[PDB]
Design a protein around this motif. Structure first.
Motif, PDB file in Angstrom:
ATOM      1  N   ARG A  49      -3.633 -99.316   1.431  1.00  0.00           N
ATOM      2  CA  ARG A  49      -3.041 -98.265   1.843  1.00  0.00           C
ATOM      3  C   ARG A  49      -1.726 -97.900   1.131  1.00  0.00           C
ATOM      4  NH1 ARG A  49      -6.105 -94.921   4.477  1.00  0.00           N
ATOM      5  NH2 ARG A  49      -4.157 -93.870   4.869  1.00  0.00           N
ATOM      6  N   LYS A 104       1.332 -87.036  -6.838  1.00  0.00           N
ATOM      7  CA  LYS A 104       1.146 -86.058  -6.758  1.00  0.00           C
ATOM      8  C   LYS A 104       2.043 -85.128  -6.384  1.00  0.00           C
ATOM      9  CE  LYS A 104      -2.783 -86.758  -4.690  1.00  0.00           C
ATOM     10  NZ  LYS A 104      -4.196 -86.236  -4.094  1.00  0.00           N
ATOM     11  N   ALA A 105       2.719 -85.364  -5.148  1.00  0.00           N
ATOM     12  CA  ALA A 105       3.998 -84.569  -4.545  1.00  0.00           C
ATOM     13  C   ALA A 105       5.007 -84.558  -5.215  1.00  0.00           C
ATOM     14  CB  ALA A 105       4.077 -84.963  -3.177  1.00  0.00           C
ATOM     15  N   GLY A 108       4.904 -84.241  -8.654  1.00  0.00           N
ATOM     16  CA  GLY A 108       4.664 -83.892 -10.074  1.00  0.00           C
ATOM     17  C   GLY A 108       4.504 -84.967 -11.252  1.00  0.00           C
ATOM     18  N   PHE A 113     -11.834-109.342  15.373  1.00  0.00           N
ATOM     19  CA  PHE A 113     -12.130-108.304  14.476  1.00  0.00           C
ATOM     20  C   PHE A 113     -13.016-107.245  15.105  1.00  0.00           C
ATOM     21  CE2 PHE A 113     -11.848-106.862  10.001  1.00  0.00           C
ATOM     22  CZ  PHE A 113     -12.716-106.002  10.093  1.00  0.00           C
ATOM     23  N   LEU A 141     -11.666-103.375  14.286  1.00  0.00           N
ATOM     24  CA  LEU A 141     -10.988-103.092  12.995  1.00  0.00           C
ATOM     25  C   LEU A 141     -11.610-102.533  12.021  1.00  0.00           C
ATOM     26  CD1 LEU A 141      -8.618-106.086  13.023  1.00  0.00           C
ATOM     27  CD2 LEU A 141      -8.084-104.042  13.735  1.00  0.00           C
ATOM     28  N   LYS A 197     -11.192 -98.256  12.067  1.00  0.00           N
ATOM     29  CA  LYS A 197      -9.753 -98.084  12.506  1.00  0.00           C
ATOM     30  C   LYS A 197      -9.366 -96.657  11.814  1.00  0.00           C
ATOM     31  CE  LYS A 197      -6.178-100.959  11.390  1.00  0.00           C
ATOM     32  NZ  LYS A 197      -5.065 -99.887  11.100  1.00  0.00           N
ATOM     33  N   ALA A 237      -6.266 -94.119  10.535  1.00  0.00           N
ATOM     34  CA  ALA A 237      -4.953 -94.010   9.781  1.00  0.00           C
ATOM     35  C   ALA A 237      -4.297 -92.622  10.245  1.00  0.00           C
ATOM     36  CB  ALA A 237      -4.951 -94.011   8.404  1.00  0.00           C
ATOM     37  N   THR A 263      -0.761 -87.599   7.465  1.00  0.00           N
ATOM     38  CA  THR A 263       0.499 -87.403   6.675  1.00  0.00           C
ATOM     39  C   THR A 263       0.220 -85.789   6.283  1.00  0.00           C
ATOM     40  OG1 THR A 263       0.398 -89.787   6.260  1.00  0.00           O
ATOM     41  CG2 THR A 263       2.178 -88.175   5.163  1.00  0.00           C
ATOM     42  N   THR A 287       1.913 -84.555   3.222  1.00  0.00           N
ATOM     43  CA  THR A 287       2.381 -84.102   1.970  1.00  0.00           C
ATOM     44  C   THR A 287       1.357 -83.386   1.399  1.00  0.00           C
ATOM     45  OG1 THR A 287       3.407 -85.351   0.030  1.00  0.00           O
ATOM     46  CG2 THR A 287       1.590 -86.398   1.129  1.00  0.00           C
ATOM     47  N   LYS A 288       1.856 -82.647   0.237  1.00  0.00           N
ATOM     48  CA  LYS A 288       0.951 -81.800  -0.547  1.00  0.00           C
ATOM     49  C   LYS A 288       1.635 -81.867  -1.958  1.00  0.00           C
ATOM     50  CE  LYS A 288       1.872 -78.109   2.040  1.00  0.00           C
ATOM     51  NZ  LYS A 288       1.972 -76.667   2.470  1.00  0.00           N
ATOM     52  N   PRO A 289       0.575 -81.902  -2.941  1.00  0.00           N
ATOM     53  CA  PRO A 289       0.737 -81.830  -4.150  1.00  0.00           C
ATOM     54  C   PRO A 289       1.836 -80.810  -4.806  1.00  0.00           C
ATOM     55  CG  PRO A 289      -1.512 -81.321  -4.080  1.00  0.00           C
ATOM     56  CD  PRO A 289      -1.121 -81.457  -2.688  1.00  0.00           C
ATOM     57  N   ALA A 290       2.296 -81.055  -5.880  1.00  0.00           N
ATOM     58  CA  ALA A 290       3.412 -80.314  -6.515  1.00  0.00           C
ATOM     59  C   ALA A 290       2.560 -79.193  -7.286  1.00  0.00           C
ATOM     60  CB  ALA A 290       4.118 -80.811  -7.584  1.00  0.00           C
ATOM     61  N   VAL A 331       3.022 -78.066 -10.132  1.00  0.00           N
ATOM     62  CA  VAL A 331       2.318 -78.300 -11.524  1.00  0.00           C
ATOM     63  C   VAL A 331       1.199 -78.993 -11.719  1.00  0.00           C
ATOM     64  CG1 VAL A 331       3.967 -80.625 -11.568  1.00  0.00           C
ATOM     65  CG2 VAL A 331       3.076 -79.716 -13.743  1.00  0.00           C
ATOM     66  N   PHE A 332       0.794 -79.712 -10.487  1.00  0.00           N
ATOM     67  CA  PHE A 332      -0.473 -80.628 -10.370  1.00  0.00           C
ATOM     68  C   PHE A 332      -1.618 -79.524 -10.398  1.00  0.00           C
ATOM     69  CE2 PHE A 332      -3.856 -82.291  -8.026  1.00  0.00           C
ATOM     70  CZ  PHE A 332      -4.072 -83.753  -8.654  1.00  0.00           C
ATOM     71  N   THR A 340      -2.432 -77.550 -13.673  1.00  0.00           N
ATOM     72  CA  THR A 340      -3.156 -78.346 -14.424  1.00  0.00           C
ATOM     73  C   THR A 340      -4.587 -78.522 -14.043  1.00  0.00           C
ATOM     74  OG1 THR A 340      -1.005 -79.337 -15.025  1.00  0.00           O
ATOM     75  CG2 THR A 340      -3.021 -80.570 -15.697  1.00  0.00           C
ATOM     76  N   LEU A 341      -4.792 -79.048 -12.882  1.00  0.00           N
ATOM     77  CA  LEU A 341      -6.118 -79.193 -12.373  1.00  0.00           C
ATOM     78  C   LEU A 341      -7.222 -78.014 -12.388  1.00  0.00           C
ATOM     79  CD1 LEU A 341      -8.152 -81.253 -10.717  1.00  0.00           C
ATOM     80  CD2 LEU A 341      -7.128 -79.853  -8.691  1.00  0.00           C
ATOM     81  N   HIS A 400      -6.436 -75.469 -14.755  1.00  0.00           N
ATOM     82  CA  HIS A 400      -6.072 -74.934 -16.002  1.00  0.00           C
ATOM     83  C   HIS A 400      -7.486 -74.872 -16.621  1.00  0.00           C
ATOM     84  CE1 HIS A 400      -4.775 -74.619 -20.122  1.00  0.00           C
ATOM     85  NE2 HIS A 400      -3.694 -74.085 -19.633  1.00  0.00           N
ATOM     86  N   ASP A 401      -7.676 -73.995 -17.377  1.00  0.00           N
ATOM     87  CA  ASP A 401      -8.800 -73.999 -18.693  1.00  0.00           C
ATOM     88  C   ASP A 401      -8.751 -74.995 -19.701  1.00  0.00           C
ATOM     89  OD1 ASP A 401     -10.749 -72.231 -17.896  1.00  0.00           O
ATOM     90  OD2 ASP A 401      -9.333 -70.394 -18.438  1.00  0.00           O
ATOM     91  N   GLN A 404     -11.400 -83.520 -14.890  1.00  0.00           N
ATOM     92  CA  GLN A 404     -10.424 -83.479 -16.001  1.00  0.00           C
ATOM     93  C   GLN A 404      -9.787 -85.135 -16.161  1.00  0.00           C
ATOM     94  OE1 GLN A 404      -6.819 -81.278 -14.596  1.00  0.00           O
ATOM     95  NE2 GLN A 404      -6.368 -82.889 -12.883  1.00  0.00           N
ATOM     96  N   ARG A 406      -4.842 -83.578 -22.277  1.00  0.00           N
ATOM     97  CA  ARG A 406      -5.771 -83.536 -21.254  1.00  0.00           C
ATOM     98  C   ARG A 406      -6.960 -82.806 -21.514  1.00  0.00           C
ATOM     99  NH1 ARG A 406      -6.819 -78.566 -18.750  1.00  0.00           N
ATOM    100  NH2 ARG A 406      -8.089 -78.614 -16.726  1.00  0.00           N
ATOM    101  N   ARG A 425     -11.207 -81.234 -20.279  1.00  0.00           N
ATOM    102  CA  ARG A 425     -12.241 -81.099 -19.205  1.00  0.00           C
ATOM    103  C   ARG A 425     -13.805 -81.748 -19.691  1.00  0.00           C
ATOM    104  NH1 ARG A 425     -10.447 -76.160 -15.648  1.00  0.00           N
ATOM    105  NH2 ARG A 425     -12.719 -75.841 -15.254  1.00  0.00           N
TER     106      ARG A 425
END
Lengths: 58, 185, 222, 159, 51, 171
Positions: free
Chosen positions: C38, C48-49, C51, E23, E28, E31, E33, E36, E38-41, E43-44, E47-48, E50-51, F7, F25, F27
RNA sequence: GAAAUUGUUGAAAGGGAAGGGCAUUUGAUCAGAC
RNA sequence: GGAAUACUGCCAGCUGGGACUGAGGACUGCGACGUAAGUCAAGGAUGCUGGCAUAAUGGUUAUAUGCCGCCCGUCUUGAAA
RNA sequence: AAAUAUGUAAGAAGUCCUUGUUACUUAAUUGAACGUGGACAUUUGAAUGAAGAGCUUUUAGUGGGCCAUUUUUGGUAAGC
């Protein structure tokens, strides 16, 4: 009639059956080909140490 | 298929079950294969292996080496056991009293140690006295003293005793053996 | 000397404590296997969060299966195949990834298929096809005492402990892997996935590094 | 017919150098050679007395006996299925100290030193050598290092 | 005299792993989890995409 | 195989003299994970002084396109090897997703110019955002208003080997 | 009183050879076991 | 903005159908379930039932069918030649 | 000036410290070789594997070879 002149074919493979290992390394190697002047000295020096140790360890 | 890294069905190359058809030797081996199996003592392993050995691997131990063996520091009371044959050495005019264990003694040796106060015993009597080989020492006769070993390996520049029927002058003591007559060896 | 309940009650007590000790370390590895599995998942979110890119640790362990038969192999690959104990088709061995082992893997690439194995693949292999080298004899594990008497020096007491030393390359991985007999696998159950085997995996074939697709291949073999 | 002499096919092998011909520097003679020193055999075309055979060029040996101006060297030679011991006599111009042994000796000093310091606290200093391990994880960030996308280029002749 | 297999023959499995009982009883293998959010920035994602 | 767009980002290995490399980078259209990493090393070595051993891959992320239902018209540029020379090319594929367009291109090149996967470079794949910006006729044809056509001579596949009436191809 | 080779009777097969191997159908015959 | 599904992977998750095999021959070992007694799928098949008890199975042999099968020994790099 | 090949090393027969011998060597108990005494033992000195390791005797057959990828010579070439 002509024949084959020389090839090394199959010669290396025969050499690996009972193969080409380094023979051995002994301690206290031979003294063949050593300067005789140093060899005469070696005997006289050798006797002196042996006799001296014999008297000490009598 | 398999890519074999070693030769298949290779026998051990060691001798077990000696090939002599003597019934009495088989009994000695049987007593010592049981002994080496069940005593966990390295002495009975040696004797059992030595009972296998051939005649040229049992050179005759002489009473002189036994005397020298007993003159080692702290060995004059140990039992001497020879897996092989004991011969007489008329080159020594004294002898200790120590007992000997062996397969065969010569009459001169049997006379010798018995005269000197000793007592020659067999290998089974050794077992009932020294089951783990207590206070014993193994003596092995000189293997490289036989006249055939002198001839082993002969070639140029090693001096290794040519096979020859009649020796003397004019018997392969000529060109090849001197610089005056051709090359030497 | 009745000797039918005195020592028997002693041996049962010595058995129960060993089963007892085996239990925590199996439980201990579970939180250790869960937590790490994990961490990399969560450390990827943080990158990723924030950058950035989380570059995971390079894999320390590979499973190698010999793909080619025993005929017509030049001297150098044949020697390297022997040093990894792959001496027949469909044989398995764990190799510790190191510079001195990578160069061995390149020489044997046309003859082997390998990748990075997961817990499920390795756990299933030892349970089904795990054999220990017991005095130069191939012995099914089939008991914890068999591993105990042979790998108990290094702290290895069970078949599950042995898997632990494999996946997490420990100080005694060399002895542990050596104890494990080379795995004799069968052909894949669903096939090889390609029409022609002896091309690189990148080139539509079978041999080479298939980084996680070895798990699918070995499971069909196992 | 065929021609197999002592210096057959040695044209480039004993060729001197580029811009180093002439008399040799005297560090080559100031050297001191002991019995048991590990040496390599690179010939010197200028010095004709005491040259080795072509077979021993670049071969490393060990000194057994030392003379006024030359040195005896023990070499193992592969012939047949075996190594036959070979003894060579070489002047000190065609012999130089083998540096291969040298970095092991400096490793011993540190190896002996690290254990001596470690025993004061017993930390299992791990005196062995390790190969190059697989890399471990890291975080690469893109502040001012935003990725730039590259594409395959079209064809051009350039002539 | 005969190799019985774990991964089946549950009796053999419990012999080699005392943890198999807990077990399984704790599930188990399936199981869950904790979630959460959280989310990517930004800039990420660019870029993903992007051309 | 069936293609996926990934990518791939890689860089030279960091060192004390020059840390923080440029993180290039690219593709890649590939069937699986291992091929995508490979093709990145293949193409990168053609631009920069780098190879697989002297650099690292930092990330890989599969790109699946935004609208798997909207029908696009893609302009594609390639660079491929014939039996005699290397040639550039430009075509259109009208389909529903970017990956299916490349999957059409590879079959299309393999059918018309016998260009296998090894001898093809996909330069760039872009959407033609504006109609009447299409320059090839075979995709310009389907852009008419109220397009409709029949499918004459329909052939039914029979399960049984014997049919008890002559088949009819109405449709 | 053998074999090659031959006659007679009996059985079987045979569309430019015959003979052989694995497997079984069919026909003839047969040991064991109860 | 909130879900779902796909794909990939995991479960010491459950469960149906088919095929081949039954080596071993008092107990011992490891386990599992049970307060205990004891039981078990735990170091290799047993229980119930039917027909026949005879050329029925099986052996042999002849033939038929499907597939396959070049003449032996020898010299030889190489033989059905 | 590659690639592929090729020699050597990765310890206990090692390292360090003191000093006994000598008809050799040095201006010089200066060195050279061999030893005496002391200290450093299981991560004891990279990887992987080891199917046992090392050794000896004797004796058979063979001593017409041929083919394939890669390298390569003569030849227009060749099942040369």
């Amino acid at each position: 009639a002509k024949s084959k002149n020389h090839t090394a074919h199959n010669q290396t493979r025969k050499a690996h059956r009972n193969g080409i290992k380094k023979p051995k390394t002994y301690k206290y190697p031979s003294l063949k080909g050593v300067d005789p002047k140093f060899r005469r000295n070696h005997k006289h020096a050798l006797h002196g140490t042996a006799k001296a140790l014999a008297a000490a360890k009598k | 298929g398999i890519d074999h890294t070693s030769k298949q069905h290779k026998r051990s190359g060691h001798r077990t079950a000696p090939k002599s058809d003597n019934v009495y030797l088989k009994l000695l081996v049987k007593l010592y294969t049981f002994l080496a199996r069940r005593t966990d003592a390295p002495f009975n392993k040696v004797v059992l292996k030595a009972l296998f050995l051939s005649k040229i691997n049992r050179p005759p131990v002489s009473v002189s080496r036994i005397a020298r063996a007993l003159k080692q520091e702290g060995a004059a009371n140990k039992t001497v056991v020879v897996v092989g044959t004991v011969t007489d050495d008329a080159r020594i005019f004294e002898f200790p009293k120590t007992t000997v264990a062996a397969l065969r003694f010569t009459a001169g040796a049997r006379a010798k140690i018995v005269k000197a106060g000793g007592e020659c015993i067999t290998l089974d009597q050794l077992a009932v006295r020294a089951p783990k080989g207590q206070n014993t020492l193994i003596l092995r006769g000189p293997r490289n003293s036989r006249e055939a070993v002198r001839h082993f390996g002969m070639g140029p520049h090693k001096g290794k005793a040519p096979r020859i029927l009649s020796t003397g002058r004019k018997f392969e003591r000529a060109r090849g053996r001197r610089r005056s007559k051709g090359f030497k060896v | 000397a009745e000797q039918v309940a005195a020592e028997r009650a002693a041996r049962k007590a010595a058995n129960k404590e060993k089963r007892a000790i085996i239990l925590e370390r199996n439980a201990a590895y579970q939180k250790e296997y869960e937590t790490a599995e994990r961490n990399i998942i969560q450390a990827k979110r943080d990158a990723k969060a924030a950058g950035s890119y989380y570059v995971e640790a390079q894999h320390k362990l590979v499973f190698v299966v010999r793909i080619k038969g025993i005929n017509k192999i030049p001297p150098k690959p044949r020697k390297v195949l022997q040093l990894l104990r792959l001496t027949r088709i469909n044989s398995g061995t764990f190799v510790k990834v190191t510079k001195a082992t990578l160069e061995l893997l390149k020489l044997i690439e046309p003859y082997v298929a390998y990748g990075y194995p997961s817990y499920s693949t390795i756990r299933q292999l030892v349970y089904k096809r795990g054999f220990g080298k017991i005095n130069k004899q191939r012995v099914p594990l089939s008991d914890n005492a068999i591993i105990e008497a042979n790998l108990g020096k290094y702290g290895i007491l069970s078949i599950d402990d042995l898997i632990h030393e494999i996946i997490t390359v420990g100080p005694h991985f060399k002895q542990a892997n050596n104890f494990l007999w080379p795995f004799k696998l069968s052909n894949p159950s669903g096939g090889w996935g390609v029409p022609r085997k002896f091309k690189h995996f990148i080139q539509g074939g079978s041999f080479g590094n298939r980084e996680e697709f070895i798990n699918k291949l070995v499971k069909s073999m196992n | 017919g065929k021609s197999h002499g002592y210096r057959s096919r040695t044209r480039y092998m004993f060729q001197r150098d580029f811009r180093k011909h002439g008399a040799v520097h005297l560090s080559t003679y100031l050297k001191v050679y002991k019995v048991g020193d590990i040496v390599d055999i690179k010939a010197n075309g200028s010095i004709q007395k005491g040259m080795p055979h072509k077979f021993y060029q670049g071969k490393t040996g060990v000194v057994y006996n030392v003379t006024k101006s030359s040195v005896g060297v023990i070499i193992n030679k592969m012939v047949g299925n075996r190594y036959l011991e070979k003894r060579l006599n070489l002047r000190v111009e065609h012999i130089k100290h083998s540096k291969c042994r040298q970095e092991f000796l400096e490793r011993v000093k540190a190896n002996a030193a690290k254990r001596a310091e470690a025993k004061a606290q017993g930390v299992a200093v791990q005196l062995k050598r390790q190969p190059a391990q697989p890399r471990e994880s890291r975080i690469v960030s893109t502040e001012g290092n935003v990725p730039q996308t590259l594409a395959p280029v079209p064809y051009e002749t350039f002539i | 005299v005969l190799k019985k297999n774990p991964l089946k023959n549950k009796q053999v499995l419990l012999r080699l792993n005392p943890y198999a009982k807990v077990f399984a009883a704790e599930k188990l293998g399936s199981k869950k989890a904790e979630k959460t959010g959280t989310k990517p920035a930004a800039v990420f994602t660019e870029t993903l995409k992007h051309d | 195989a069936h293609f996926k767009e990934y990518q791939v980002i890689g860089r030279r290995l960091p060192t004390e003299s020059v840390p923080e490399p440029k993180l290039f980078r690219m593709r890649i259209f590939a069937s699986n994970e291992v091929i995508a990493k490979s093709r990145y090393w293949y193409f990168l070595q053609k631009l920069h002084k780098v190879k697989k051993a002297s650099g690292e891959i930092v990330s890989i992320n599969q790109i699946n396109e935004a609208h798997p239902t909207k029908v696009k018209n893609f302009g594609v540029w390639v660079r491929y090897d014939s039996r005699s020379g290397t040639h550039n090319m430009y075509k259109e594929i009208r389909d529903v997703s970017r990956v299916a367009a490349v999957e059409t291109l590879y079959q299309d090149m393999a059918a018309r110019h016998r260009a296998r996967f090894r001898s093809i470079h996909i330069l760039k794949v872009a959407e033609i955002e504006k109609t009447a910006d299409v320059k090839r006729q075979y995709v310009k044809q389907f852009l008419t208003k109220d397009l409709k056509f029949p499918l004459p001579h329909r052939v039914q596949k029979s399960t049984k080997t014997f049919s008890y009436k002559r088949p009819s191809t109405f449709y």
